[PDB]
Every structure is written in structure tokens, then in C-alpha cells.
């Protein structure tokens, strides 16, 4: 139904919950199809027990070929599900750090500027960037772990992306000079953010 | 410590909980190695940016080589972890159905057999065989989802494995038929269950 497809998943359901549920639904559906084909294969096999060799091989080629078309569907579906999910996760992570940066800039320009609000907004921005850094490392680590050939294709891009994040954080930290008197009041807490709480981009 | 390795995990930790914990330990461990190398790479990169391309290209290949060794180690380690875990799940499923068969044979052979006991045992048994069947299909649907050539090669084994389960179930139900009055009695419940 087109209207349902327009509305999409409810707001209650997170991307992660919806992903798992769709993965699970395909998995059940595909287990049923595979099981039916396997049963037919078995049933043809039971009648043909004493068949001549080449007749038995033809019976096997018949079902192997059905299974192949099935396997390729299963994997095509999977790619589509996994690409849609990966694209959404990246967008969410991009949104979280950009909205947090927004919060930080709004707090800096407040009048009278409020140290606690600025500090809080900065903690939230630094976490969001760290979430992107960990996602970049973990996805690389995961592809290395289950698909080592795909991993070699990524290295340089991963390497570049981490430098990008690191510079951007430092350029953002630099925006504290927008309110240098708030900068000075916050100096010890900033050392604490970056190194005690380990929110710094080079931790 | 060898003695700790002998004892293995505590009994209160399931194989599943244990497996996820170990996978996550290794994951956090390997992300740090990779971050360490990536940062070394960035510093060498930066330090040598004004140098000749021959000096620079020789540098890139150096860390690429380093990471390739790292990818290999990560991949192999995940293989050993997945092998250990698959081997243990198959043993658990084996043990549950064999233990359940034992119960069904005992109750069946009791003097005299009692329909409530048999039928509880037969139910526990069937569930156990259904569990191995689900596992066999799900594993295969998963290799199909992820690795095409490996699915092509296990295809016939899975077929064979499913037939074996089916033959065991039929044989076990046929033992019930040895007692026609007990078989006919439980059969309505069984047929409900067998197609449940
Ligand atoms: O023994 C008893 O407990 C009791 O026995 C009697 O007293 C009673 O029975 S009776 O009345 O006498 O007949 C009864 O009270 C009880 O038995 C029955 O109830 C219990 C309790 O459940 S319930 O509350 O009633 O619902 C049942 O046991 C509990 O639930 C099962 C269950 O599967 O539902 C188990 O749940 C956990 O463990 C399983 C298996 O363990 S393990 O093999 O992993 O070590 C987990 O499934 C596996 O992992 C998932 C997974 O990771 O997602 C799946 O893996 C595949 O998919 C993933 C992708 O997913 S994801 O994106 O990563 O999330 C992929 O990465 C994997 O590679 C892929 N594997 S595959 O392709 O090779 O297949 C698969 O489902 C499993 O993978 S596998 O290892 O390869 O097979 C499951 O996820 C996990 N659930 S949990 O929520 O995370 O905890 C537990 O055994 C148990 O949980 S509990 O908390 O300890 O209670 C019992 O089954 C039932 N017996 S029965 O009804 O008679 O049959
Ligand atoms: O390689 C594949 O293509 C692949 C696809 C399939 O999904 C699956 O195949 S199958 O199962 O074999 O069939 C495999 O999935 C991989 C997955 O691709 C990979 N992602 S990665 O980016 O390459 O590293 C990895 O996934 C784990 C990641 O940590 C993360 O993925 S992410 O979507 O890219 O970010 C995601 O993390 C989930 C948490 O698991 C979830 N926690 S839960 O408790 O609610 O279940 C939640 O965490 C929140 C939450 O608010 C709270 O967590 S809690 O622990 O305290 O409860 C905390 O605040 O942290 C939050 C958070 O971490 O964000 O959501 C996150 C992220 O949300 S998101 O999914 O929307 O992005 O999933 C992890 C996971 O283990 O699933 O590993 C997968 C499986 O590992 S594998 O089997 O070894 O390959 O392969
Ligand atoms: Zn510092």
C-alpha cells in the first residue's frame, strides 16, 4: 500500500529496531522457501533411489539450479537492506554532530554567556564526533573481520576520514575564541573534557 | 594461567553470552590497534608531505603493508572464534535432542506406558529436532546472504542433513505406532504438534 510506504516506520521504532525486524522477517520468509525446495528435492530423491547414475545427477542439477536462483535473491535482498541501513546510520551520525555543533555555537554567543551551558554543549559535540570516529574504526574492523579483501579497498579512505574528523574537532575547539573571557573561565574544565574524560580527538 | 584455561567459563554464563563478550573484547582490542597505526600513518604522512613522491609513495605502501598484516590477524581470529562457537552450538543441540530421545524411549517402554508422560517427552524431543532443523536452514540462509560460493558448496550437505533429521523423526514416531492404542490416542495431539 502506497500511503503506508509514504508514512514509513513509526517514530517510536528506531532505525536499529526497524532494521533488525526487517532482517528477521526476510530471514523467516527465506527459510520457508528454502525448506520447501529442500523437501521437494528429498521427495524426488526418495522415489529415484535406484535410478541410473546420470538420471540421479540430472535430478540433482535440477534442484541445485533452483537453489542457486534462491541464494542470489537472498543475497540481493541482504545487500539492499544493508545499504539502506548503512546510509541511514551515517546520516544520523552526521545530524547528531552538526546539531551539537549548533548547540555549542548558540551557547557561545549567548549574552550573558553561560559557562555551564557552553561546557555542556561542547561535551555533547565532542561525543558526537567521537561517535563518528568509533563508527569509522569499527566498520573498518568489521569488514576486515568478515571480508578481508573489501578491507584493503578501504584503508586509505578510512585513514583520510579519521584525519578529517580530527581536524574538524580542532577547528571547532578553536571557536572558543568567539568569547575569550568565557574561554579563560573554562580553561581547566576544557583540559578535563579532552584528557580526563578522554573526549579529545587525539585520545 | 593454564589452570584458568582448564576451567573455562563459569557455569552461569551461557555460551551465547560468553561468545558475544569475547567478540566485543576482541573488537575493542582491535579498534585500538588500528587507531594507533592510523595515527602513526597520519604523522609520517604529514612529516613527509614536502618530500619527493618517491619518498612519499614508499611511505604509504609501508603502512598499507602494516594494515594488511593487521587485517589478516583480525580475519583469522574471527574465524577461530566463529569455529569455536559453531562447534559448541552444534554439540548443545545434539545433546538436547539425544537427551530428549532417551526420555521418550524410557517413557515409551515403561510398564505400563502413560500417555501424559510419553506425550510430554515426545514434545520435548520434536522441539529439539526442530531446533536442529531451524539451525541448519538458518546457517545456510546466512552463508547465502553473505558468501555466494560457500553456499554453492554446502548446498548438497544441507539437503542431506535435513533428510537425516526427517528420517530420525519418522523413525521415532514409528516407535510410537508399535503401540496402536497409545498411538491413536496421542495422534490427535501429536498431529496438532507435528504440524505445529
Ligand atoms: O532449557 C530451557 O531453557 C527450558 O527447558 C525446559 O525447562 C522448558 O521446555 S519444556 O517446556 O520442558 O519443553 C522451558 O522452560 C525452557 O526451554 C524453552 O524456553 C527457553 C526460554 O525462552 S523463552 O523465554 O521461553 O522464549 C528457550 O531458551 C531461551 O531462548 C533461546 C532462543 O533462541 O529463543 C535462546 O536465546 C539465546 O540463545 C540463542 C542460541 O544460543 S547460541 O547458539 O547463540 O549460543 C541465540 O540464537 C543465536 O544467535 C542469534 C543472533 O545472534 O542473532 C541468531 O544468529 C544468527 O543471526 C545473527 C544475526 O543476528 S544479529 O543481527 O546479530 O542480532 C548472525 O550474526 C548469526 O551468525 C546467525 N547464526 S546462524 O546463521 O549460524 O544461524 C540465531 O538465532 C542463533 O545463532 S546460532 O548460534 O548460529 O544458532 C539467541 O539470539 C539468544 N537470544 S537472546 O535474547 O540474545 O538471549 C536461549 O537458549 C534461551 O535464552 S535465555 O535468556 O537463556 O532464557 C528454549 O529454547 C526453549 N526450549 S524449547 O521451546 O523446548 O525448544
Ligand atoms: O557486515 C554486514 O554487512 C552485516 C550485516 C548484518 O546486520 C549482520 O549480519 S548477520 O547478523 O550475520 O546476518 C552483521 O552486522 C554487523 C554490523 O554491520 C556491524 N556494524 S559496523 O558499522 O560495520 O561496525 C556491527 O554492528 C554493531 C555496531 O556497534 C552498530 O552498527 S551501526 O549501525 O553501524 O552503528 C550497532 O550498534 C547498535 C547497538 O547494538 C544497539 N544496542 S542495543 O542494546 O539496543 O541492542 C544500540 O545502542 C544504542 C543504545 O542506546 C545503547 O546501547 S546499550 O548497549 O547500552 O543498550 C547505548 O546508548 O549505545 C547506543 C549506540 O551504540 O548507538 O544501537 C546501536 C547503533 O544504532 S544503529 O544500529 O542505528 O546504528 O549494531 C552493533 C551490533 O552488534 O549489531 O556488527 C554487526 C554484527 O556483528 S558480527 O556478527 O560480528 O558481524 O553483518
Ligand atoms: Zn590538551
- Cis ω on the peptide bond leading into residue B36 (within 30° of 0)? no
Residues of A within an 8 Å Cβ radius of B: 27, 30-31, 34-35, 38-39, 41-42, 45, 60, 63-64, 67-68, 70-72, 74-75, 77-78, 134, 137-138, 140-142, 144-146, 148, 151-152, 155-156, 158-159, 162-163, 166, 202
Q: Please tell me the distance from the alpha carbon of residue A27 to that of residue A25, in angstroms, as a whole number.
A: 5
Domain residue limits, chain B: 1-196
Contact by Cβ (8 Å): B85, B17: no
Contact by Cβ (8 Å): B70, B33: yes
Calculate helix-pair angle for A115-146, A53-108, nearest 10 degrees: 160
Grid cell listed for B70: 593487521
Q: Please tell me the distance from the alpha carbon of residue B147 to that of residue A78, in angstroms, as a whole number.
A: 11
Range A17-25 contact pairs with CB under 8 angstroms and sequence separation of 24 or more: A19/A81, A19/A85, A22/A81, A23/A81
Contact by Cβ (8 Å): A136, A162: yes
Secondary structure of chain B in HEC code, one letter for each residue: CHHHHHHCCCCCCCHHHHHHHHHHHHHHHHHHHHHHHHHHHHHHHHHCCCCCHHHHHHHHHHHHHHHHHHHHHHHHHHHHHHHHHHHHHHHHHHHHHHHHHHHHHHHHHCCCCCHHHHHHHHHHHHHHHHHHHHHHHHHHHHHHHHCHHHHHHHHHHHHHHHHHHHHHHHHHHHHHHCCHHHHHHHHHHHHHHHCC
CB-nearest partner of B71 from A35, A151, A166: A151
Sole residue written with cell 533452483: A66
- Cis ω on the peptide bond leading into residue B96 (within 30° of 0)? no
- Could you please state the CATH topology (level 3) that the domain comprising B1-196 is classified under: 1.20.120
Q: Please tell me the distance from the alpha carbon of residue A181 to that of residue A115, in angstroms, as a whole number.
A: 10
* Size (chain B), residues: 196
Contact by Cβ (8 Å): B185, B115: yes
Contact by Cβ (8 Å): A152, B71: yes
User: Which residue does chain A place closest to B76, by CA atoms?
Assistant: A145
Q: Please tell me the distance from the alpha carbon of residue A123 to that of residue A119, in angstroms, as a whole number.
A: 6
Residue B8: φ, ψ to 5°: 60, -160
From the CA of B129, the nearest ligand is 1
Give the C-alpha distances (Å, rounded to integers) separating A98 from A93, A133, A149: 9, 14, 33
- Could you please state the CATH topology (level 3) that the domain comprising A1-203 is classified under: 1.20.120
Give the C-alpha distances (Å, rounded to integers) separating A31 from A19, A78, A106: 18, 14, 53
Amino acid at each position: 500500500d502506497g500511503v503506508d510506504i509514504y508514512f514509513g516506520m513509526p517514530g517510536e521504532i528506531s532505525e536499529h529496531e526497524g532494521f533488525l525486524r526487517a532482517k528477521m522477517d526476510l530471514e523467516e520468509r527465506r527459510m520457508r522457501q528454502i525448506n520447501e525446495v529442500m523437501r521437494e528435492w528429498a521427495m524426488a530423491d526418495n522415489q529415484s533411489k535406484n535410478l541410473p547414475k546420470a538420471d540421479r545427477q540430472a535430478l540433482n542439477e535440477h534442484f541445485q539450479s533452483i537453489l542457486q536462483t534462491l541464494e542470489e535473491q537472498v543475497s540481493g535482498e541482504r545487500q539492499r537492506l544493508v545499504e539502506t541501513h548503512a546510509t541511514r546510520v551515517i546520516a544520523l551520525i552526521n545530524d547528531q554532530r552538526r546539531a551539537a555543533l549548533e548547540g555549542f555555537l548558540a551557547a557561545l554567543q549567548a549574552d550573558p554567556p553561560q559557562a555551564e551551558r557552553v561546557l555542556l554543549a561542547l561535551r555533547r559535540y565532542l561525543r558526537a564526533e567521537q561517535k563518528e570516529q568509533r563508527h569509522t574504526l569499527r566498520h573498518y574492523q568489521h569488514v576486515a573481520a568478515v571480508d578481508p579483501e573489501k578491507a584493503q579497498q578501504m584503508r586509505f579512505q578510512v585513514h583520510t576520514h579519521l584525519q578529517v574528523i580530527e581536524e574538524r574537532v580542532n577547528q571547532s575547539l578553536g571557536l572558543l575564541d568567539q568569547n575569550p573571557h568565557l574561554a579563560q573561565e573554562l580553561r581547566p574544565q576544557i583540559q578535563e573534557l579532552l584528557h580526563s574524560e578522554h573526549l579529545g580527538p587525539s585520545e
